[PDB]
Amino acid sequence: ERPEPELIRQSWRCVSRSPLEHGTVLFARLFALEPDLLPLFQYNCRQFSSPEDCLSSPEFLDHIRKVMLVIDAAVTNVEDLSSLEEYLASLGRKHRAVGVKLSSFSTVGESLLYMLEKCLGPAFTPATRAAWSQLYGAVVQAMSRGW
Numbered sequence: 001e002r003p004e005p006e007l008i009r010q011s012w013r014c015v016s017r018s019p020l021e022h023g024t025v026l027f028a029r030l031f032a033l034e035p036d037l038l039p040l041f042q043y044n045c046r047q048f049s050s051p052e053d054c055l056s057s058p059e060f061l062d063h064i065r066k067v068m069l070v071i072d073a074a075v076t077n078v079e080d081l082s083s084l085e086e087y088l089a090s091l092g093r094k095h096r097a098v099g100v101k102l103s104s105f106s107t108v109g110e111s112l113l114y115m116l117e118k119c120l121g122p123a124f125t126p127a128t129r130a131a132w133s134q135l136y137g138a139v140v141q142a143m144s145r146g147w
């Protein structure tokens, strides 16, 4: 289904002003659901590979901001995601090459919905949750070409 654009745009405003705070919620959920992702971050951390320091490092914070900016790109292009097909395919290839499993992107989708739910509370309606599931599903499909 094409995600209902107004529901995507309005609900995104909840997180989009403070993207590091909200992206940090997403990542907390990601580690709660798939804690085995930590080593992949640790081994890619250049400044500090120990757990706490890697997770608080500029590289890791930068990556939280990158995740939120890619979702913002999908929100702002929700009516025509063809404008991100090559970017997303290449993004998938890049993750595959640093050892990420395609299946971990399902965990990310769960974490994104969790983040939104926490920000919006009862404004995160079933229609709005569905629209997000559809938008994220289209992003992962475009990325999945990289595996």
Ligand code: HEM
Pocket (backbone or CB within 6 Å): 037, 040, 041, 044, 063, 066, 067, 068, 070, 071, 091, 094, 095, 098, 100, 104, 105, 108
């Ligand atoms: C599933 C968990 C994820 C892991 C373990 C992960 C890990 C990484 C790693 C290690 C890099 C560095 C790649 C390199 O040096 O070539 C990277 C880059 C990046 N990641 Fe992720 N990532 C994840 C999910 C995501 C998601 C969901 C997005 C956005 C939807 C995203 C956006 C990016 C971007 C934009 C870059 C920069 C790519 C570039 O340099 O061209 N990541 N990620």
